[PDB]
Amino acid sequence: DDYLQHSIVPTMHYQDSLPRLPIPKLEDTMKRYLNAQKPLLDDSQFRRTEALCKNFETGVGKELHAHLLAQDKQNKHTSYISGPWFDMYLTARDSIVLNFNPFMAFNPDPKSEYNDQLTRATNLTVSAVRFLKTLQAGLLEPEVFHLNPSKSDTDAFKRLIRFVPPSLSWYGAYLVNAYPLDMSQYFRLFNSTRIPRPNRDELFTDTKARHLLVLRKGHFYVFDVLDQDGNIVNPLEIQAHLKYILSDSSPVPEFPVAYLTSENRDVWAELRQKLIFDGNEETLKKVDSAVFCLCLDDFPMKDLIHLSHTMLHGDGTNRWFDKSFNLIVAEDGTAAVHFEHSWGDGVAVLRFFNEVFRDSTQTPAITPQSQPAATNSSASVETLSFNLSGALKAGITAAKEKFDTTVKTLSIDSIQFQRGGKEFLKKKQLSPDAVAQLAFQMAFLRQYGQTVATYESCSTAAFKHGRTETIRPASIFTKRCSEAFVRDPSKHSVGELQHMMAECSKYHGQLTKEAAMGQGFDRHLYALRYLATARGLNLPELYLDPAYQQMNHNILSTSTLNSPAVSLGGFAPVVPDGFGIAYAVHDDWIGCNVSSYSGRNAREFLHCVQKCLEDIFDALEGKAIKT
């Protein structure tokens, strides 16, 4: 059939009974905030922040917290954090390009010839539309985190849980140590876009739409991928339509409209309104409502640096940055998902990506020898036409200049540390994630001689309308261990270094477990701030502390994925003097893809990460570290 999964448990079976997202005790949040500040602040600064924390906890913060809890109890259908979190990103006026939108790139199809561009674009597109149908049918398996897959991720369990009413279903999974996740964001994968508006942007969906949007050379094309009965269009007709688009000989437009999606959101909100005034609403609606955006690039990937730039931003002409996601396929079949971050936390995107990689490579719709259907693509494929005023043309020109100037400041590079990975580290009783994070702390100390604000995300999707929480990897323990390796390597025995690493790992594990339970401090403190502002109050003194601003100016911004579908991922720094560190610890190696703007040096950072990983592995092997 046209489905890529056949779940007997309805996709949304657990949604009604997911547990509510906890709100920490204010005393715990203040202690955790201070614990994270300890490595970052000098003694004098820390004493000042400590004093503000004491005043907050006894005064205005106590009152905000009381009100936050009361509000939560009146809004039990949701979480305390989801609204405030959406609001932050939808209100943000900065360009979504670099600041927010990341990418993940697919591994190639393991069969060489299936990486032909037309072939792969067809197969990925068909798999994506199969995913859409499977999700909409309730045939996608529920998202569930298992502690023991052997007992809980079984046909036996699934045959039983399907009979348990959704009001009690979560409890059935809980009984077998499995944790269903929130899936309320998943629908915005398709037929969805972000619309620029004054004050706060809109998330738009039109589930009735049946067409794909394709960008090539900055031109916009639409054609149906679902027929009037809801069935997938013949893959050989889809192939014909993509071949038609690939065969088009029009050069890049004088004023490529896609540039506008990279602008400041107020600038783009105004220009979109002008497009509407100039008669383009119907055309914009076709763009906005398409199942997703497929981007066909006409060049091959030169290397991983070029790949990263291409998938993270491109040249500004051939991505519709506002779309829920852009599926990009280059001339050598290299493919990736670039996605808009405001509509969710990316778990939906990773699920999509994983299922699409599996389906497209294991049961491809077409082969490299498939013959396109003899179809009237000139009728079935509409080339969209925008009516551009002088103001719009000038707007596109200004958007292009801004884009080109910004991209010029961005550097990206990677390493592949070959000495070992998860297997070695687990044998040494360490958390691989903790070791990677330690290496980044150590590298930054080596390079810049400082300990800085560091961000790692953790999912809180085990809870109703759960989002993410911040794990703060820069700890008293990583600071201590980094100082030992970098500044006083001769002062410590290998056993002493090993104990320090074990401590780093334990503490990182503790923070990880806590964050997954909603017991970080970042979201709680943000919610209290948001509440004060929403109620029309002046910002409490806690938040005017330079230390609070520093905690949230994330110089080391990190992110990881663990998936056999993912070749690599990437994102730009979140601050001008930051790094954007995409990493993955594989069984036998460690990968790092790091971005920087002019104010930092990614190449030097990566040389430092390599060296730090060498020293960590040496120390774990009992070797004296190399000076």
Swiss-Prot record:
EC number: 2.3.1.21
Protein location: Mitochondrion inner membrane
InterPro entries associated with the record: Carn_acyl_trans, Carn_acyl_trans_N, CAT-like_dom_sf, Cho/carn_acyl_trans, Cho/carn_acyl_trans_2
Modified-residue entries (N6-acetyllysine), positions: K208, K274, K479, K513
SUPFAM superfamilies hit by this protein: CoA-dependent acyltransferases
Active site: residue positions: H341
Gene Ontology process terms (BP): carnitine metabolic process; fatty acid beta-oxidation; in utero embryonic development; long-chain fatty acid metabolic process; long-chain fatty acid transport; positive regulation of cold-induced thermogenesis; response to fatty acid
Pathway(s) this gene product operates in, as recorded in its UniProt entry: Lipid metabolism; fatty acid beta-oxidation
Gene3D superfamilies in alphabetical order: 1.20.1280.180, Chloramphenicol acetyltransferase-like domain (3.30.559.10), Choline/Carnitine o-acyltransferase (1.10.275.20), Choline/Carnitine o-acyltransferase, domain 2 (3.30.559.70)
Entry keywords, A to Z: Acetylation, Acyltransferase, Fatty acid metabolism, Lipid metabolism, Membrane, Mitochondrion, Mitochondrion inner membrane, Transferase, Transit peptide, Transport
Job description of the protein: Involved in the intramitochondrial synthesis of acylcarnitines from accumulated acyl-CoA metabolites. Reconverts acylcarnitines back into the respective acyl-CoA esters that can then undergo beta-oxidation, an essential step for the mitochondrial uptake of long-chain fatty acids and their subsequent beta-oxidation in the mitochondrion. Active with medium (C8-C12) and long-chain (C14-C18) acyl-CoA esters.
Protein name per its UniProtKB record: Carnitine O-palmitoyltransferase 2, mitochondrial
Organism of derivation: Rattus norvegicus
